[PDB]
Design a protein around this ligand. Structure first.
Ligand SMILES: COC(=O)c1c(O)cc(O)c(Cl)c1CCc1nccn1Cc1ccc(Br)cc1
Length: 213
């Protein structure tokens, strides 16, 4: 259940963390970007499988703040990941030219190599990935960066299909819990995205999904 990061991933996480120290906001750009990709992947799959979207009729990104529990949730209803995929796609990488371009901006570089997930550790002490893939049951990937574990989700299939990224925010990254801030940041980083992105918001005092693009 417990796993070690591959060396290159450790180096990569460091390079990422040690080059975007200034513009931390990028983590949210990249998570929204990967969320879109997940939906693309499942839409494509839906072209040749009418049963592809059975676990969830919708194709969205839902973002939820939990100021109280110090958590930020980003949930796509994309393709999701199987257990094996969690262990492989988040624990290794398929690359070393990337690690040399990185040393010699660099926010555009991680975006290009599709490896911006790890930027989440810029604002989080622990990162949790809850994922339901059509071919598998719901599993959970957790890491504080020093290792990771993948477990079967005891709650069963709550996602229907897809992925929630959950960030336990750092002391200094509390700013990103304010609904003001996240609405603002998603507005910015979600224009080019063509799936709907909602933020769970407060209107006059009620709560519902609010569309941001
Ligand atoms: C898009 O794949 C995912 O399931 C997914 C998601 O739905 C939301 C996310 O925030 C993230 Cl990070 C992912 C995984 C995408 C990812 N980032 C780094 C590695 N990976 C796995 C991966 C990379 C390339 C391909 Br092609 C497939 C999976």
């Amino acid at each position: 259940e417990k796993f070690a990061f591959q060396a290159e991933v450790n180096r990569m996480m460091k390079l990422i963390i040690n080059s975007l120290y200034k513009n931390k906001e990028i983590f949210l750009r990249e998570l929204i970007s990967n969320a879109s990709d997940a939906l693309d992947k499942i839409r494509l799959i839906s072209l040749t499988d009418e049963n592809a979207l059975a676990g969830n009729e919708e194709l969205t990104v839902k973002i939820k703040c939990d100021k109280e529990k110090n958590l930020l949730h980003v949930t796509d209803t994309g393709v999701g990941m199987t257990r094996e995929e969690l262990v492989k796609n988040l624990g290794t990488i398929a690359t070393s030219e990337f690690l040399n371009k990185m040393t010699e901006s660099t926010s555009e570089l991680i975006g290009q190599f599709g490896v911006g997930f790890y930027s989440a550790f810029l604002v989080a002490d622990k990162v949790i990935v809850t994922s339901k893939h059509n071919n598998d049951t719901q599993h959970i990937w957790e890491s504080d960066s020093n290792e990771f574990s993948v477990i079967a989700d005891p709650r069963g299939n709550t996602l229907g299909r897809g992925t929630t990224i959950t960030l336990v925010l750092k002391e200094e990254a509390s700013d990103y819990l304010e609904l003001d801030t996240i609405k603002n940041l998603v507005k910015k980083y979600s224009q080019f995205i063509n799936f709907p992105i909602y933020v769970w918001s407060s209107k006059t005092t009620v709560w519902d999904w609010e569309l941001m693009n």
